[model samples]
Target: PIERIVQVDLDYIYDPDPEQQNRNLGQLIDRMKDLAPSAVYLQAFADPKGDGDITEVYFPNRHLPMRADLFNRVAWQLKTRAGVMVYAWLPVLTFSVPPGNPAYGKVVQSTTRKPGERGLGSPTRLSPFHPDAHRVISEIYEDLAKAAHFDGLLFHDDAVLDDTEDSSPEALATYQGWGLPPDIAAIRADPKLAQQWSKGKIRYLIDFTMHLRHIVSGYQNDRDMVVARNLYAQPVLDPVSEAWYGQSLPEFLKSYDFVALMAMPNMEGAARPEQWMRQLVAAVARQKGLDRTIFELQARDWRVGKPIDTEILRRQMVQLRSLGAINYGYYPDDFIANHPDAEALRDVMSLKS
Candidate 1:
C-alpha cells in the first residue's frame, strides 16, 4: 500500500481565541476522518509572519517560544479519531534562538567574495557544526519527545547549504578540524577540495539528524519512529546540484526511512511541468528510491497567489501513478476551506479511494 501524506500547516489552522481554535481543530480532525489519508504531516512549528523562519513552535520546547502547547493534543486526537498516522513536521535548521544566547547561530554565506555578497544577510538557520546549537536543538527534540506521542517525523526542507554557505566561525573551525582548509575560498579554489568540503558538510548534517533520532528514540518504548527528510528536486534531478543544496538524494535514501521529494514544478519555474515530474520520477527510479520516496506535490502555486487547480493536481497525481510512482503526497492542505476541494481530492488523495 502506498503512503499518502497531507501536510497540514498549523499556522493557518490556529485561531487566536482558545474556543475558536478548539472548534477549528475539531473541524480539521473531522475533515481528516472523511479524507482518511495514510498519514498527516502536521506542522509542529509556527511562522506567523510568513517569512519562512521559525519564530515559535507548537510544542512546549525548552528553547523556543511555545506558540501554543497544542501539538500533542492535535497529534493524539488525529491518530485516535482521525485514524491516521501523525508525523510532526518540524524544521531542521530554522529555530528562533535569541541572538544573546550562546547557542545562537545562522547559516552565513561565504565571506570570501565581494560585489553582490558584500552586504548580503545570512539565513536564520543554526550552523550544524556548532556544538551549542546541537545542544539546544537536542533539548527541543527531547522536549517534543516527552510531550508528544506520534508515529513519525518529517523534517522540513529548510535543511540546506548552497555552494556558498556556512562560513560562520564555527563552521570554519569544523572545516579545519576535518583537515580541510579553514577558509571557504581556499577550499573552493580546488575542485577536489570543494567536493570534499561539500561531502563533509552533507555527512555532518545527516549524522546530526541520526543523533537527534537517537535522542527521541530513548523516550519511545518501542524505540521506533519512521523518519522522513525533505529533498529538493534539483539535487535529485541533477547530481551536480548536490553542492548547490548540500543534499544528495542517494545519501538521503541511504540514511532516512523516506525521502520526501519536493516535486514543485511551478516553484522551480519549469517550462513544462509534466516533463519535470517525469524526469524526477525517472531519477528516483534510477536510484531505486521509489519505495522509500514520497513525491510531495505542491498544493498552492506561490507564483500565482492561488491554490493550484484541483484538476491540475489530480492530473499530476495520475501522472505520478502512471509513471509507476506509488508513494506520494501534497503540502499546505486547506482542509478548513478545502482549497483544493475536499471532495475533489478525496478520491485521488485518499488511500481507500
Candidate 2:
C-alpha cells in the first residue's frame, strides 16, 4: 500500500485582508508540520489585480506585483520551518469583476458570446490561441519556477473553460489567417455540427495550453510534478468523450506527472462509490506510468443547507482504498477544516485492519 498523505489547500495566501495577510506565515507552517500534511498548495495570483494587496473576488483593478522577494519569503518559511513540500496552485483563467479592477478592459483576445457578440462581465479568460495569453501564463510559471522552491505545480479545474465566445477580433483575425470560416453563427446553430466544431476548437487551444506546460517543464530545476484535475466524470452519459473536455487520459498522462480525478457525482444525487472508484482505478492502471489520485467529495450539503454524514464518507474511503489508489484527498479549505476526522477515516481505510 502507498503511504497515506494529506494535501492542505491553504486559503490564507490569497486572502485580501491585511490582518490575514499579516498573520505569521511561520505559525501557519508550524500548524502544517503538526498536522503532517503531505504537501501544501498555495495561491499565486489573486483575481488578476495589479495592486500588491491581495483582494477578494475578481477585479482587474489590481494586479499583484510580481515580486520574487515575497515568493522567496513564503517559500523559505515553508521549507525551512514547516519541512513540507509546497505545490503552487495557480488559477490560469479566472477573472473576477469589482469596481476597481485594474485590468478590467485590457485583456487581449477576449471571448465571444455568439460569434461576434462581446462577452459579458470581467473577461477572466485569455484566448489560449493568442500569443499574449501564452506569454502571460508562461511568464507566471517562469516567475514561480525562478522564485519559489516548490515541489510541484497544480493546475486546478475550470482553468481553461469559460462560458463565452471565442470570436474576439484577434481570434477572428487568426482564423481568417488560417483560411478558416469566419461565420461562427452557422456553426453554433446546429447541435451536431456545433459539437464537432467546438471539439476541434477546444483541442487546438488545449494543444497550445499543453505547449505552455512543456515550456515550464523545460525550465524547472528539479523533478517537479505537474497535476491537472476534472478530466472527466465516471459513469457519465458519455464515458468516452475526450473530444468534449480536451482531456484524453492517455494523451494527458504522457505529459503530466499525475491526474486528480475529481469525482463530484455526489452533488447530483447519484453518488455511486463502487462504479466511480472502479472506473478511476481502472483508467489509471491501464495507462503506463500514469499516477492517479482522487478528490474525495467532503463538502456539506449546501443545496439543502445541512452537514455531510461522516459514516457515508468513511464507507466511501474504505471502498476506494480497497481499489488501491495511490493517493486520496479532499477539496478546498472548508472541506479539510470541517472534516479533520476524515483523515483518521483514511488511515483506517489504508490499513484495512
Candidate 3:
C-alpha cells in the first residue's frame, strides 16, 4: 500500500544552529512520529543555498559538501523511531551552478529556440544524453543510495527533456547515432522533423533510465528495493507534453515500480479540481496501468497562493478509492512543522489502509 506519502525537498529546512546544521533530524523525526506517515520522499540533491551557487547535499560524496550528512541521519532516525520508509528523491539533469563558474557546469542553448537566444548553466538544464552529464548524474544517485540505503529511488520531473532542449554537441552526437538527421538545429526548424526528434528523445530517456536502473539495482540484493519516477499530469491531458518532455508514461510503467503522476489539479487551471482528479485517476487506472502506480498529488495549491482546501483533498482521495486505484501520495513536506492544514492533514494521513 503506497498510502499517504510526502515529498520533502531540502530547501524547506533552515537553521543557523550548527548542532542543528544536520537540519535537526531529531525534531523532524519526532514530528513524523506524530503525523504517522507511511513513507517520505527525501530530496537527494539541489542548490538549497537558494542562490544557485552551492549544493546542499544530503549524503556524503566526492562531488560536493554533505550539508551535514542530511539524508543519512534522517533515514536512520525516521526508520528507527517513526518507522517510515525513506525514498531518496533525485532531481537529475537540472541543477544550478554559480553564474560564472567554469569548474562544473554545462553551457547549453536550445536548437528549437528562436534565433540568437542562448544561456549558460544553473537556470538552463543539463542534457542527460550527454556522456559527461550521464556519468556525473549516475554517480550522484549511486553514492546517495549507498550512503543512506534508501528503500526506493524516485526521479523527479527535472529528470526530463523538452522540445527546445538538448542541442549540445554531445547530445547531438548521441542522437545522430540513432540514425536521425545529423543536424539538430535543422530538425528544430522543421515541424515534421521536430516530431521525429521528440519521439527519439523519449526513447533516449527510456534507455537512459533503464541503464540507470541497472546501476542502482547492483547495490543491494533486497527484494523490495524499487525505482520510481515522477511525471507531470500534462502528458495525460494531451500528447504534446509526452513527446516534448520525453516522458512516455506507458514505457515508464514497464520500467519503474511506481510512476507518480503529479496530481495537482490547481496548477492545471481546472474549474473543478475534484472532477479533474476523478477523470484523470480513472483514465490512468484503465490504461493498462501497473498495480503499483501512485498519484503523487500536491497538498497545497501552489499556483493559486493558498493551502489546498482540505475538503478538496478528501474528495480526491475518495475518488481514488472509488476508482479502484491502489496507491496515493501528496507532497511539498509542509507537515514536518505544525502547518495550518496539520489538523486536516492528520485526518488524511490517518485514513484507513
| Deviation in Å, model 2, residue 331 alpha carbon | 1.5
Regions of model 1 farther than 4 Å from truth: 105-109, 112-122
Lowest summed lDDT over 10 consecutive residues: which window, candidate 3? 115-124
lDDT of 3 by residue, 1-353 (tens): 55567777665554557565455555566667876777888877655543334455767764656665567766677788888888888665664434443325663446546544432223445567656667766776677657877687787676566666677777778768877667876887888878888878877776777666667767654557777788777776675777566786676787788887888877778798777877777667667672767887776766665666666676676677777775777777554454425556576576365
Residue 136 in candidate 2, Cα distance off native in Å? 2.5
lDDT of 1 by residue, 52-101 (tens): 66878998877888888889999999999999999988877778777776
**Tens-place lDDT digits, model 2, residues 204-322:** 65566466566656666553555554444532224344433445555545445555555545664556756765665666666642244444454356467455565765566566657
TM-scores, one per candidate: 0.94, 0.68, 0.85
Worst 10 residues of 1 by lDDT: 113-122
Q: Count the backbone clashes (under 3 Å) in each candidate.
A: 0, 16, 0
Best by TM-score: 1
Error of 2 at 183 (Å): 3.6
Candidate 2: Cα lDDT at 319: 65
Predicted structure with the largest lDDT when compared to the true one? 1
Sorted by TM-score (best first), the order is 1, 3, 2
List runs of model 2 lying over 4 Å from the truth: 1-9, 13-31, 34-37, 47-78, 95-123, 162-165, 172-180, 186-199, 214-220, 223-248, 268-290, 293-296, 299-312, 333-338, 342-353
